[PDB]
Design a protein around this motif. Structure first.
Motif, PDB file in Angstrom:
ATOM      1  N   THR A   1      -7.776  -1.271  -7.784  1.00 58.84           N
ATOM      2  CA  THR A   1      -6.636  -1.315  -6.869  1.00 58.84           C
ATOM      3  C   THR A   1      -6.087   0.085  -6.546  1.00 58.84           C
ATOM      4  N   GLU A   2      -6.930   1.101  -6.670  1.00 52.37           N
ATOM      5  CA  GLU A   2      -6.527   2.450  -6.287  1.00 52.37           C
ATOM      6  C   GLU A   2      -7.732   3.295  -5.946  1.00 52.37           C
ATOM      7  N   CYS A   3      -7.490   4.404  -5.254  1.00 51.74           N
ATOM      8  CA  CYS A   3      -8.542   5.321  -4.848  1.00 51.74           C
ATOM      9  C   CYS A   3      -7.958   6.711  -4.932  1.00 51.74           C
ATOM     10  N   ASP A   4      -8.718   7.608  -5.544  1.00 49.66           N
ATOM     11  CA  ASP A   4      -8.306   8.992  -5.714  1.00 49.66           C
ATOM     12  C   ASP A   4      -8.559   9.824  -4.450  1.00 49.66           C
ATOM     13  N   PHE A   5      -7.483  10.296  -3.821  1.00 47.08           N
ATOM     14  CA  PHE A   5      -7.581  11.124  -2.616  1.00 47.08           C
ATOM     15  C   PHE A   5      -7.198  12.585  -2.916  1.00 47.08           C
ATOM     16  N   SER A   6      -7.417  13.038  -4.147  1.00 51.33           N
ATOM     17  CA  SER A   6      -7.069  14.406  -4.523  1.00 51.33           C
ATOM     18  C   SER A   6      -7.841  15.496  -3.774  1.00 51.33           C
ATOM     19  N   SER A   7      -8.991  15.148  -3.211  1.00 47.14           N
ATOM     20  CA  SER A   7      -9.784  16.134  -2.481  1.00 47.14           C
ATOM     21  C   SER A   7      -9.270  16.448  -1.071  1.00 47.14           C
ATOM     22  N   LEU A   8      -8.248  15.725  -0.602  1.00 47.61           N
ATOM     23  CA  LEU A   8      -7.668  15.994   0.725  1.00 47.61           C
ATOM     24  C   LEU A   8      -7.073  17.408   0.742  1.00 47.61           C
ATOM     25  N   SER A   9      -7.270  18.143   1.833  1.00 48.64           N
ATOM     26  CA  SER A   9      -6.726  19.496   1.943  1.00 48.64           C
ATOM     27  C   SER A   9      -5.227  19.398   1.685  1.00 48.64           C
ATOM     28  N   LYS A  10      -4.710  20.285   0.840  1.00 47.86           N
ATOM     29  CA  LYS A  10      -3.299  20.240   0.500  1.00 47.86           C
ATOM     30  C   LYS A  10      -2.352  20.533   1.660  1.00 47.86           C
ATOM     31  N   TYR A  11      -2.832  21.256   2.666  1.00 46.62           N
ATOM     32  CA  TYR A  11      -1.982  21.627   3.792  1.00 46.62           C
ATOM     33  C   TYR A  11      -2.069  20.752   5.033  1.00 46.62           C
ATOM     34  N   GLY A  12      -3.095  19.917   5.114  1.00 44.28           N
ATOM     35  CA  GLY A  12      -3.231  19.061   6.278  1.00 44.28           C
ATOM     36  C   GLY A  12      -2.253  17.900   6.359  1.00 44.28           C
ATOM     37  N   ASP A  13      -2.195  17.290   7.538  1.00 42.66           N
ATOM     38  CA  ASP A  13      -1.357  16.125   7.776  1.00 42.66           C
ATOM     39  C   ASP A  13      -2.395  15.013   7.885  1.00 42.66           C
TER      40      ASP A  13
ATOM     41  N   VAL B   1       0.836  -1.181   0.000  1.00 38.51           N
ATOM     42  CA  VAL B   1       0.000   0.000   0.000  1.00 38.51           C
ATOM     43  C   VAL B   1       0.880   1.242   0.000  1.00 38.51           C
ATOM     44  N   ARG B   2       0.619   2.158  -0.929  1.00 38.14           N
ATOM     45  CA  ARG B   2       1.411   3.382  -0.992  1.00 38.14           C
ATOM     46  C   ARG B   2       0.669   4.533  -1.643  1.00 38.14           C
ATOM     47  N   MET B   3       1.084   5.744  -1.297  1.00 37.60           N
ATOM     48  CA  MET B   3       0.492   6.926  -1.874  1.00 37.60           C
ATOM     49  C   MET B   3       1.341   7.332  -3.099  1.00 37.60           C
ATOM     50  N   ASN B   4       0.681   7.468  -4.236  1.00 32.35           N
ATOM     51  CA  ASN B   4       1.335   7.855  -5.478  1.00 32.35           C
ATOM     52  C   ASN B   4       0.782   9.259  -5.712  1.00 32.35           C
ATOM     53  N   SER B   5       1.539  10.261  -5.295  1.00 32.40           N
ATOM     54  CA  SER B   5       1.095  11.639  -5.409  1.00 32.40           C
ATOM     55  C   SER B   5       2.063  12.498  -6.212  1.00 32.40           C
ATOM     56  N   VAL B   6       1.556  13.062  -7.303  1.00 34.82           N
ATOM     57  CA  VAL B   6       2.319  13.928  -8.189  1.00 34.82           C
ATOM     58  C   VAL B   6       1.430  15.129  -8.489  1.00 34.82           C
ATOM     59  N   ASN B   7       1.953  16.332  -8.262  1.00 33.43           N
ATOM     60  CA  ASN B   7       1.224  17.569  -8.509  1.00 33.43           C
ATOM     61  C   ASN B   7      -0.134  17.578  -7.810  1.00 33.43           C
ATOM     62  N   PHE B   8      -0.161  17.023  -6.601  1.00 29.54           N
ATOM     63  CA  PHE B   8      -1.367  16.988  -5.797  1.00 29.54           C
ATOM     64  C   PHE B   8      -2.487  16.067  -6.281  1.00 29.54           C
ATOM     65  N   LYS B   9      -2.169  15.169  -7.207  1.00 28.79           N
ATOM     66  CA  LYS B   9      -3.142  14.172  -7.640  1.00 28.79           C
ATOM     67  C   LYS B   9      -2.688  13.038  -6.730  1.00 28.79           C
ATOM     68  N   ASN B  10      -3.432  12.811  -5.656  1.00 28.23           N
ATOM     69  CA  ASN B  10      -3.060  11.817  -4.662  1.00 28.23           C
ATOM     70  C   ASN B  10      -3.770  10.485  -4.863  1.00 28.23           C
ATOM     71  N   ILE B  11      -3.075   9.517  -5.446  1.00 22.35           N
ATOM     72  CA  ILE B  11      -3.681   8.217  -5.688  1.00 22.35           C
ATOM     73  C   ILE B  11      -3.158   7.162  -4.709  1.00 22.35           C
TER      74      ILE B  11
ATOM     75  N   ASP C   1       4.066  18.697   1.576  1.00 28.71           N
ATOM     76  CA  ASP C   1       5.427  18.245   1.809  1.00 28.71           C
ATOM     77  C   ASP C   1       5.800  16.978   1.042  1.00 28.71           C
ATOM     78  N   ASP C   2       4.823  16.089   0.840  1.00 25.90           N
ATOM     79  CA  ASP C   2       5.080  14.806   0.182  1.00 25.90           C
ATOM     80  C   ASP C   2       4.768  14.657  -1.322  1.00 25.90           C
ATOM     81  N   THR C   3       3.879  15.466  -1.878  1.00 29.41           N
ATOM     82  CA  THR C   3       3.590  15.306  -3.302  1.00 29.41           C
ATOM     83  C   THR C   3       4.842  15.597  -4.124  1.00 29.41           C
TER      84      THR C   3
END
Length: 201
Positions: free
Chosen positions: A53-65, A8-18, A90-92
């Motif tokens: 096998t993936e879920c789009d989490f792009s709606s997460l606030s960009k500044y939150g932890d 399980v891993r977050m694949n995030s590029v330019n704030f498209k958090n998959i 910090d992570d995207t």
């Protein structure tokens, strides 16, 4: 008993958090998956019983932890949760900017395209998210090894004082001075300068 999602891993590029995972080996049938994010003190579903096998989490606030978790399900059973933490700003990964290069006489002119961010509501770019967004340009004469660094003031640049009919290679990346965060370099674009005599009319 249902085995949990694997790798399980977050694949995030330019704030498209998959959030992505691998289906575990399973003999009884089709598994579905449920992924959630923490909102205050309780986990909320983002994708419920998806067959993917993936879920789009792009709606997460960009500044939150954020804290996210996902599990596999079959019939009325479910696996343990697999949890990870993620902070978008910090992570995207900041991908390479786009770039259009034009040759005018013995000069290279360029315009930079800030990576876009499709939020399905507004058309934003890295500039709308990071206030100190800036570009870093790096170029060199094709063949040589000496690379020159320059930091444009805006979204374009003009390399003057270059040799005529010479081939130069240029790269650009985004940079956040306030965070020391550097984005990925664009693949090099090489162009040959022409001459004053080439200018038409």
């Amino acid at each position: 008993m249902v085995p949990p999602p694997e790798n399980v891993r977050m694949n995030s590029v330019n704030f498209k958090n998959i959030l992505q995972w691998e289906s575990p080996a399973f003999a009884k049938g089709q598994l579905t998956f449920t992924a959630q994010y923490l909102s205050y003190r309780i986990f909320q579903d983002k994708c419920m019983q998806t067959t993917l096998t993936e879920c789009d989490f792009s709606s997460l606030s960009k500044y939150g932890d954020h804290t996210l978790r996902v599990r596999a399900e079959f019939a009325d059973e479910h696996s343990d949760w697999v949890q990870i933490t993620f902070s978008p700003v910090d992570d995207t990964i900041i991908g390479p900017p786009g770039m259009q290069v034009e040759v005018l006489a013995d000069c290279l002119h360029m315009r930079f395209l800030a990576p876009k961010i499709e939020n399905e509501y507004e058309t934003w770019t890295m500039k709308n998210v990071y206030n100190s967004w800036t570009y870093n340009v790096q170029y060199w004469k094709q063949g040589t090894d000496e690379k020159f660094q320059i930091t444009p003031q805006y979204d374009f640049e003009v390399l003057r004082n270059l040799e005529p009919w010479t081939t130069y290679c240029v790269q650009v990346r985004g940079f956040l001075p306030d965070r020391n965060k550097a984005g990925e370099w664009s693949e090099p674009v090489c162009e040959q300068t022409t001459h004053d005599e080439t200018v038409p009319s």
